[PDB]
Amino acid sequence: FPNNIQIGGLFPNQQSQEHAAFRFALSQLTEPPKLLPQIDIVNISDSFEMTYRFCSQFSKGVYAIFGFYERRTVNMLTSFCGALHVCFITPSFPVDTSNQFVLQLRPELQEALISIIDHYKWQTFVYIYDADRGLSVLQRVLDTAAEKNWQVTAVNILTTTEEGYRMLFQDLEKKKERLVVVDCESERLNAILGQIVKLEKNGIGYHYILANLGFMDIDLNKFKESGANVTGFQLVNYTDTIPARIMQQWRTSDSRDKRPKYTSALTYDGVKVMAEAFQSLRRQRIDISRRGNAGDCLANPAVPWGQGIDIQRALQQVRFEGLTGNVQFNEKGRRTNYTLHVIEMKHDGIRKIGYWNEDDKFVPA
Amino acid sequence: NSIQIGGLFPRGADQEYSAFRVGMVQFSTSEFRLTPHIDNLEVANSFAVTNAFCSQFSRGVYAIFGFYDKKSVNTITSFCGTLHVSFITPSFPTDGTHPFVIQMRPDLKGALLSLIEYYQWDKFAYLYDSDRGLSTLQAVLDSAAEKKWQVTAINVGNINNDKKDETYRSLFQDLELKKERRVILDCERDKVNDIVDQVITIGKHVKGYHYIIANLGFTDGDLLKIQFGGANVSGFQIVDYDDSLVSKFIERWSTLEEKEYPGAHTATIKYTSALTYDAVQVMTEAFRNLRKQRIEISRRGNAGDCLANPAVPWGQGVEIERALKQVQVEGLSGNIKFDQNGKRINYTINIMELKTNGPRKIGYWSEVDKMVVTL
Ligand SMILES: *[C@@H]1O[C@H](CO)[C@@H](O[C@@H]2O[C@H](CO)[C@@H](O[C@@H]3O[C@H](CO)[C@@H](O)[C@H](O)[C@@H]3O)[C@H](O)[C@H]2NC(C)=O)[C@H](O)[C@H]1NC(C)=O
Ligand SMILES: *[C@@H]1O[C@H](CO)[C@@H](O[C@@H]2O[C@H](CO)[C@@H](O)[C@H](O)[C@H]2NC(C)=O)[C@H](O)[C@H]1NC(C)=O
Ligand SMILES: *[C@@H]1O[C@H](CO)[C@@H](O[C@@H]2O[C@H](CO)[C@@H](O)[C@H](O)[C@H]2NC(C)=O)[C@H](O)[C@H]1NC(C)=O
Ligand SMILES: *[C@@H]1O[C@H](CO)[C@@H](O)[C@H](O)[C@H]1NC(C)=O
Ligand SMILES: *[C@@H]1O[C@H](CO)[C@@H](O)[C@H](O)[C@H]1NC(C)=O
Ligand SMILES: *[C@@H]1O[C@H](CO)[C@@H](O)[C@H](O)[C@H]1NC(C)=O
Numbered sequence: 001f002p003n004n005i006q007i008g009g010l011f012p013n014q015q016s017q018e019h020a021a022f023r024f025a026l027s028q029l030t031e032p033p034k035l036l037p038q039i040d041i042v043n044i045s046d047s048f049e050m051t052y053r054f055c056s057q058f059s060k061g062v063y064a065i066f067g068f069y070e071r072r073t074v075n076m077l078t079s080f081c082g083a084l085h086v087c088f089i090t091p092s093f094p095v096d097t098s099n100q101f102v103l104q105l106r107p108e109l110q111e112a113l114i115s116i117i118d119h120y121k122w123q124t125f126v127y128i129y130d131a132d133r134g135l136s137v138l139q140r141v142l143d144t145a146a147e148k149n150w151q152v153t154a155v156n157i158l159t160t161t162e163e164g165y166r167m168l169f170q171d172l173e174k175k176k177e178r179l180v181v182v183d184c185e186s187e188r189l190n191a192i193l194g195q196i197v198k199l200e201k202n203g204i205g206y207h208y209i210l211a212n213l214g215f216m217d218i219d220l221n222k223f224k225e226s227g228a229n230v231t232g233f234q235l236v237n238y239t240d241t242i243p244a245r246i247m248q249q250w251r252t253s254d255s256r257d258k259r260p261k262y263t264s265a266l267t268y269d270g271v272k273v274m275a276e277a278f279q280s281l282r283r284q285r286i287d288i289s290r291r292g293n294a295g296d297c298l299a300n301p302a303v304p305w306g307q308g309i310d311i312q313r314a315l316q317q318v319r320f321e322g323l324t325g326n327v328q329f330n331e332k333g334r335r336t337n338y339t340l341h342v343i344e345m346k347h348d349g350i351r352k353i354g355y356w357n358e359d360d361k362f363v364p365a
Numbered sequence: 366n367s368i369q370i371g372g373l374f375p376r377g378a379d380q381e382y383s384a385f386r387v388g389m390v391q392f393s394t395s396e397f398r399l400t401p402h403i404d405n406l407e408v409a410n411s412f413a414v415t416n417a418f419c420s421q422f423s424r425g426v427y428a429i430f431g432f433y434d435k436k437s438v439n440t441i442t443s444f445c446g447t448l449h450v451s452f453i454t455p456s457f458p459t460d461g462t463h464p465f466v467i468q469m470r471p472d473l474k475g476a477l478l479s480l481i482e483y484y485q486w487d488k489f490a491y492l493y494d495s496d497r498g499l500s501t502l503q504a505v506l507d508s509a510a511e512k513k514w515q516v517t518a519i520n521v522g523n524i525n526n527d528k529k530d531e532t533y534r535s536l537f538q539d540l541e542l543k544k545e546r547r548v549i550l551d552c553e554r555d556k557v558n559d560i561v562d563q564v565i566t567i568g569k570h571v572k573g574y575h576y577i578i579a580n581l582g583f584t585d586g587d588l589l590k591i592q593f594g595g596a597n598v599s600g601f602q603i604v605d606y607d608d609s610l611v612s613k614f615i616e617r618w619s620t621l622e623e624k625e626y627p628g629a630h631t632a633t634i635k636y637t638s639a640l641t642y643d644a645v646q647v648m649t650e651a652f653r654n655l656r657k658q659r660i661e662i663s664r665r666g667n668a669g670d671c672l673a674n675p676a677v678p679w680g681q682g683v684e685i686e687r688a689l690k691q692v693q694v695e696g697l698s699g700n701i702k703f704d705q706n707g708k709r710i711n712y713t714i715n716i717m718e719l720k721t722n723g724p725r726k727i728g729y730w731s732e733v734d735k736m737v738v739t740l
Contacts, residue, residue, distance in 0.1 A: 046443055046447075047443040048443040048444050048447045049447075052672050055672055073439060075411055075435075075436040075437070075440075076411040076439060079410055079411035079436070080411070080412050142518045142519070142520075143520065145517075146539055153510050154510075155507070171510075298415065298671075
């Protein structure tokens with residue numbers, strides 16, 4: 001197949017860890033195919049700007065797309081991907097309703113969170129959710145709350161102010177036992193942590209849970225002294241042989257030119273996913289060709305690209321032990337058969353209580 | 366003076382287009398009129414919405430009436446903000462302050478939370494559909510945190526029609542263990558019917574139970590099933606049938622050729638259609654106000670394409686938006702006034718119960734005053 005297999009990219013910021021990781025991982029690409037980054041810097045929230053960029057990449061004839069999406073523009077993007085039969089790789093938050101052309105390289109924490117809450121004798125607690133797509137995980141909880149009969153006092157951070165937090169925590173500490181779940185983005189978690197450090201983070205029966213796939217990246221130093229419990233999840237193990245080699249090579253190269261966030265790790269893995277699919281396509285000798293018509297995305301009717309279907313299947317079929325874990329994909333187009341590491345942070349302790357698996361239910365270790 | 370207009374209508378909405386045509390004939394005049402270009406599509410396909418919006422924009426439409434769903438809000442609002450093209454909807458109001466979007470549908474959280482307090486509720490379920498957002502769900506949960514309520518929130522919007530029967534019964538079996546005698550059915554007409562037709566089967570429409578139908582159309586459904594069971598049923602209605610304009614409109618509505626105006630023969634009118642009719646009135650009033658004020662609105666040339674780098678909005682759109690927001694008229698729904706953001710204000714939401722004789726109004730609700738009681 002031709003080595004000019006142009007690939008697109010939609011990013012919010014020119015300089016960031018995620019972008020740098022995506023740029024670097026391509027260097028390791030020694031496969032006969034040559035994948036072009038073809039980056040476009042686009043604001044995520046604005047759907048119009050994104051539709052412009054996505055149609056531009058359509059004009060260029062891009063075979064596959066990698067990028068991020070937020071709550072406002074998840075639907076729009078998803079819709080175009082199921083109409084033009086064009087695949088879209090992403091490490092962004094996963095969604096319940098989606099096409100098969102959207103590959104989400106971020107396993108869902110909703111199931112594991114339920115298991116962890118179940119294991120601990122949690123009778124009532126407070127839930128803190130960011131509107132940035134966290135709602136899908138809220139319903140699950142509210143649906144399981146009825147089945148299993150615990151009380152959940154949800155509070156939204158997006159529409160909560162300092163006075164809101166003050167009142168919530170004041171009403172919370174009137175209870176003898178204080179349990180809290182904090183679903184948040186990468187950056188919102190830091191600000192909320194700063195908010196709780198000011199007060200109400202004493203550690204007097206306070207038990208926090210952090211529904212973030214990456215718990216080592218977060219700077220919980222202030223929590224190692226106050227004597228408070230916190231539980232979290234990790235998806236990336238740096239000690240293992242493949243992660244150790246990848247991290248060593250990458251950090252050595254970068255220095256010759258810290259620990260990556262989970263978003264950056266997934267970004268790096270996505271390059272491997274696309275490369276593996278295209279390598280297997282070249283090996284399988286499948287006829288892939290891009291017509292120079294480059295029809296406008298707003299073509300009535302927009303004929304699906306004939307080959308774009310098989311690409312999807314190929315991108316779905318790939319499988320390998322990547323940095324984060326073992327990469328696989330369900331029929332719906334979502335990470336399957338993976339492992340998460342439950343991790344409690346004591347005053348001086350980083351203890352791997354156990355691991356969650358799709359087949360198992362929080363088997364301890 | 367014809368002014369170009371655009372119209373979007375969801376696939377499978379016959380009454381609303383009929384009310385659109387009726388409003389055209391009613392408010393059309395020799396000196397002023399409207400030229401609508403119509404498109405019918407699946408509003409939950411952002412691709413189709415984008416295509417239709419861009420085609421109409423290329424056709425030089427000054428304003429676009431239409432509907433939208435939770436999966437097409439952001440596309441539409443972004444396009445309107447970028448291109449400074451207005452949008453008039455009876456669909457659910459945005460959870461924000463998005464510009465160049467006029468909203469004909471009043472909010473509901475205030476009336477809902479006042480009503481739940483006129484009955485001294487502490488432990489109630491909240492069945493909700495995954496549509497029109499979760500704004501009212503969040504409002505209810507927040508007021509629960511403040512007032513120490515006990516809310517059991519359940520989603521019913523992801524239920525397959527083929528297997529609908531099994532799930533609903535198990536749902537109510539779960540609710541029974543908690544003695545949930547009170548429920549809020551926050552859903553559209555169709556699912557409210559599909560649920561009321563499964564409360565009956567299991568005999569939960571009896572003296573002990575209370576239901577609140579969190580919708581602006583209370584009569585729209587079929588309440589003749591539960592009038593007599595003995596259970597309370599409360600709800601909200603914006604279209605007051607004891608009004609003058611409403612009665613005259615009904616006179617013109619019932620005497621309509623269903624061969625031409627589907628859904629028109631019936632005596633009932635759904636709030637979406639009512640707001641569509643009022644929307645035609647709104648557009649005519651604003652555009653005629655522009656004509657009287659001599660504001661210059663005309664497309665000298667052609668709007669190339671929706672997707673154009675850089676985007677170059679035409680600067681008379683601000684005038685159109687201001688005119689649309691600066692209109693004060695009576696209509697089927699009631700008094701129509703807007704903000705600088707587009708949300709409606711100074712409106713009355715009539716409250717209703719269900720009695721063996723039939724629905725009867727007991728009060729109303731206005732943002733300024735309170736929940737108000739007459740009967
Ligand atoms: C990506 O999407 C849009 C546009 O690129 C940005 O949202 C827009 O953000 C601006 C600045 O924050 C908002 O303007 C301000 O809005 C507030 C209300 O939120 C108002 O009080 C101010 O007077 C001012 O008008 C604008 O409303 C908002 N638009 C929408 C549709 O949300 C977003 O910030 C962009 N993100 C990045 C990283 O560029
Ligand atoms: C689920 O993932 C696990 C990875 O832990 C897979 O286990 C590996 O499977 C491959 C393929 O058969 C073997 O070559 C490896 O030796 C297995 N390793 C371990 C540690 O089990 C497992 O096969 C996956 N399940 C499915 C259905 O694909
Ligand atoms: C169904 O409606 C009736 C009438 O509104 C309710 O009966 C009233 O409820 C109050 C509340 O304590 C009781 O004192 C009486 O039974 C009735 N009084 C008045 C003034 O109406 C009944 O409670 C409703 N059912 C439910 C489940 O709320
Ligand atoms: C907090 O951690 C301690 C161990 O330090 C343990 O008893 C339990 O996990 C938690 N106890 C609380 C929060 O009272
Ligand atoms: C990482 O893997 C090593 C062995 O490969 C294991 O000893 C260690 O506990 C793992 N770390 C986590 C956090 O699971
Ligand atoms: C606004 O509301 C009042 C009642 O509060 C009602 O007469 C009518 O709808 C409006 N009247 C005004 C704005 O004077």
